[PDB]
Symmetry: C2
Subunit: 244 residues, 2 copies
C-alpha cells in the first residue's frame, strides 16, 4: 500500500502562483519511499502543474461534471481533466455537498465519469457535528459511502473528512480517524471483497505537520487529504517528513 | 457600437481540441467590420486560447465564484480567470440557474467579483415557456435583471436568452429579440442613465448563421450569445459572413 498525501488547495492560487509553488516544491522535493503526493488544484492551474511539478507528483482536479460533454455551462468534464494531464480528482467534497447540493448519487455519477476517463476519484464522506454528537458517525458515514460508491469500481480512494474538522482547527483524534477508517474498510470488503485491502482510505480535516504522523500511523488509515496546510511548501515538506 | 459575437462552447473541447480550434480559426479568420469575437471556454482551455487565438479575439470563462478566495473546493475565482488572460466571463447562464440553483443575488455577486478583477461580466437573463405563454416575458425578465445587476457597475453585458430557445432549435423571432432588448435598454437607463446607451445587449438561444443577421440588425440588439453554432469553425465563419 502506497501511503497517499493528497493536497487540496481549494480555491487558492492563480496560474502564476501555481507555477511558483511548483517551482519551489521542485527545489525542495526529496521522494519518500512508500509515499505518493497528489496536488488537487483549480482546473485552470493544471497546465502550470503539468509543466512545473516534479516527476512522480501526481496532480488532479477538485471536482468533475456528472456528464460526459454538452450544454452544461461552467462545468468541466473528466475527458478535459484527463487531457490536461490529471490522474485523480476529488468528488463529493463536503463544501460541494453543502454549497452545491451534491447528493450521494451525483457523487457516484461523478466518480464513474472519472473512472471512465482514466482518473482516480477521491470520494469524500463524513458526518456533521450533530451526527457525531448523537454517536451515529459510523452508521451515517457508511450509509453515505454506500450511496457515494454505487456503481463505482475498486479503483477509488475514500477520504473520511468529518465536517466539524474542516477549516475549524478541530482535528479528529488518531483514534477517531482509525475508528472510521476501520469501519470503512469493513464496508469496502462487503462491496469489493479482497480488493478492499488495497483501497486507500484517507483522513482529512485540519491535518497539519504536527498531527499527521500519528493519524496515518494507524492500521487502516493510508494517508491524508490536506486543506490549508497544503498551501505552503514548508508545510508540505513537514507533512512528507512525518510520513517518511 | 461594436456587434459582439460571443461564442459559448459550454462543456465542450479538451485543451488539445481548443488549441486545434484556435489554430484552425487563426488560418481562416478574416475580421468583419465592427464585429468583435469572444470565446467563452472551460477554464482549463484558457491557456490554449491565450497562446493560439488570432489577433483581436477575446476569451473568457463560463462562470466565476462569488468569493475572492478560500475554502470553496472546485470553484474558480475572478482573480484566477484574470491571471489566465480572460477578459470576460458568463454569469447567471440559464443552465447554471437551473442546474446549480444560482439566485439573482448570487449572479450579482459573481458579476461584482468579475468587475473587481478587470473582467467584463456577461449577465444572462430570460424567461421559461410558462412565463412566455402568460405573455409576461418582459416584466419577469426585467425583474430578473434588476436583481442580477444589484450593485453591478455599468461595465457589463446583458444577454437575453429565453430558456425555451436554448438547445431547442426554437429561435426567438428578430421582433421578439428586439422587444426584450428595447425593454432591457429602458431598464438600463433607469439604473445607469446615459451609460445605458453603450451597454451591449445580446440575444442568445438557437442562433445560427441563417438567423443571426436579422436579430443583430435590430436597433437595440448589439450581438449574439452563441451556443451550439460556436463549436465548429465553419459555423463561426458563416455567422461572421452574415454580419459582414
Ligand atoms: Ca497506516
Ligand atoms: Ca480537504
Ligand atoms: Ca449560450
Amino acid at each position: 500500500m502506497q501511503t497517499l498525501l493528497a493536497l487540496n488547495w481549494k480555491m487558492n492560487k492563480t496560474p502564476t502562483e501555481a507555477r511558483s509553488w511548483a517551482e519551489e516544491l521542485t527545489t525542495k522535493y526529496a521522494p519518500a519511499e512508500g509515499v505518493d503526493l497528489a496536488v488537487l488544484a483549480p482546473a485552470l492551474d493544471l497546465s502550470a502543474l503539468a509543466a512545473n511539478l516534479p516527476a512522480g507528483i501526481a496532480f488532479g482536479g477538485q471536482d468533475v461534471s456528472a456528464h460526459e460533454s454538452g450544454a452544461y455551462t461552467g462545468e468541466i468534464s473528466a475527458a478535459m481533466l484527463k487531457d490536461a494531464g490529471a490522474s485523480c480528482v476529488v468528488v463529493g467534497h463536503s463544501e460541494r455537498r453543502e454549497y452545491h447540493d451534491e447528493s450521494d448519487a451525483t457523487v457516484a455519477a461523478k466518480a464513474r465519469q472519472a473512472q471512465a476517463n482514466g482518473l482516480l476519484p477521491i470520494v469524500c464522506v463524513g458526518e456533521n457535528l450533530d451526527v457525531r454528537e448523537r454517536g451515529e458517525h459510523v452508521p451515517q458515514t457508511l450509509a453515505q459511502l454506500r450511496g457515494s460508491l454505487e456503481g463505482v469500481g475498486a479503483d477509488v480512494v475514500v477520504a473520511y473528512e468529518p465536517v466539524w474538522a474542516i477549516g475549524t482547527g478541530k482535528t479528529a483524534t488518531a483514534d477517531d480517524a482509525e475508528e472510521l477508517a476501520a469501519a470503512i474498510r469493513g464496508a469496502l470488503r462487503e462491496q469489493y471483497g479482497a480488493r478492499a485491502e488495497g483501497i486507500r482510505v484517507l483522513y482529512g480535516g485540519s491535518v497539519k505537520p504536527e498531527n499527521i504522523a500519528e493519524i496515518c500511523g494507524k492500521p487502516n488509515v493510508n494517508g491524508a487529504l490536506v486543506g490549508g496546510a497544503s498551501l505552503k511548501v514548508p508545510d508540505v515538506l513537514g507533512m512528507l517528513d512525518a510520513l517518511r
